[PDB]
Design a protein around this ligand. Structure first.
Ligand SMILES: COc1cc(CNC(=O)c2ccc(F)c(CNC3=NCCN3)c2)cc(OC)c1
Length: 304
């Protein structure tokens, strides 16, 4: 019915706002990225600081794991992405081509491609092994807020401050569908559901929506949080109860029942906007991270 997430660890070390937290697919790590130009690796279960990964010349707005938990990709204001070997901490490739800040990134499930979105209004598709840019999509007419592959890798969903949500054919780069075709409000985050049938989208009017991709129709709307300014990550929680999880500009983590749309819990503790949340792949564990008045990551655990 409702979860009982409670604060277990607070992870300190970043010196500017945290921008993104992500659990490794094998469950043992949390990665965090920050405006302080650093990636940090933490033990997922005990919050134990593991290492700092450094090399970007300006702040990092997103980081993402490969399917095998061995690689990270980061998106930076230095206009590049970097692919990192987590074990060594070494930068394997620097992905050059965007002409403005890189804001968002993800691997495909095969982990042979990286997709990126930028303030230059484009979506780029990159070959992981060579670091070459395979395609540049003129996807949007304002900064790109999120990019995500579906479960079989054949689709990319993108969102932008231009108000659009578009779905792209990975193989050809051509647009399959414009899911949201408004010019306002900004679409500040999007992500496929784990089975690839639905799309979770945030708009900067304090709204999250669950869309049916195939039918192009809105199935659920989630409200009650504060989101009018920042591109805040949102998540499907699937290890226990089926929830939607999101940060909020009132410094709380919100948890909703996916089916009934009722708020089931609000997690209090951060002292700034909760910009990023992540859900552990096998345990009922949430990671949350906050902006510059706070700069910490918090690990929360639930019995269900
Ligand atoms: C007025 O125009 C704007 C204002 C903005 C406002 N900036 C942010 O919300 C922001 C800044 C730094 C971050 F690290 C993060 C968190 N990172 C992240 N979220 C989803 C993928 N990665 C968010 C954005 C924008 O385009 C994107 C255009």
């Amino acid at each position: 019915v409702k979860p009982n997430y409670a604060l277990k660890f607070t992870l300190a070390g970043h010196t500017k706002a945290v921008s993104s937290v992500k659990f490794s697919p094998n469950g043992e790590w949390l990665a965090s990225s920050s405006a302080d130009k650093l990636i940090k690796i933490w033990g997922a279960y005990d919050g134990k600081f593991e290492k700092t990964i450094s090399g970007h010349k300006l702040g990092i707005s997103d980081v993402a794991w490969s399917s095998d938990s061995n690689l990270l990709v980061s998106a930076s204001d230095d206009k590049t992405l970097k692919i990192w070997d987590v074990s060594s901490g070494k930068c394997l490739k620097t992905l050059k081509g965007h002409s403005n800040y890189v804001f968002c990134c993800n691997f495909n499930p095969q982990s042979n491609l990286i997709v990126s979105g930028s303030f230059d209004e484009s979506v780029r598709i990159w070959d992981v092994k060579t670091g070459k840019c395979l395609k540049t999509l003129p996807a949007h007419s304002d900064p790109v807020s999120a990019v995500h592959f579906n479960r079989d890798g054949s689709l990319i969903v993108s969102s932008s401050y231009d108000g659009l949500c578009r779905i792209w054919d990975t193989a050809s780069g051509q647009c399959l569908k414009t899911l949201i075709d408004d010019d306002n409000p900004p679409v500040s985050f999007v992500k496929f559901s784990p089975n690839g049938k639905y799309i979770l989208a945030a708009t900067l009017d304090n709204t999250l929506k669950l869309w049916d991709y195939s039918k192009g129709k809105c199935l659920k709307t989630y409200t009650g949080h504060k989101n009018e300014k920042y591109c805040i990550f949102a998540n499907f929680s699937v290890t226990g109860g089926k929830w939607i999880v999101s940060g909020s500009e009132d410094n709380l983590v919100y948890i909703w029942n996916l089916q009934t749309k009722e708020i089931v819990q609000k997690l209090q503790g951060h002292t700034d906007v909760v910009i990023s949340t992540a859900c552990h792949p096998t345990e009922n564990i949430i990671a949350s991270a906050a902006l510059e008045n706070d700069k910490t990551i918090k690990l929360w655990k639930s019995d269900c």
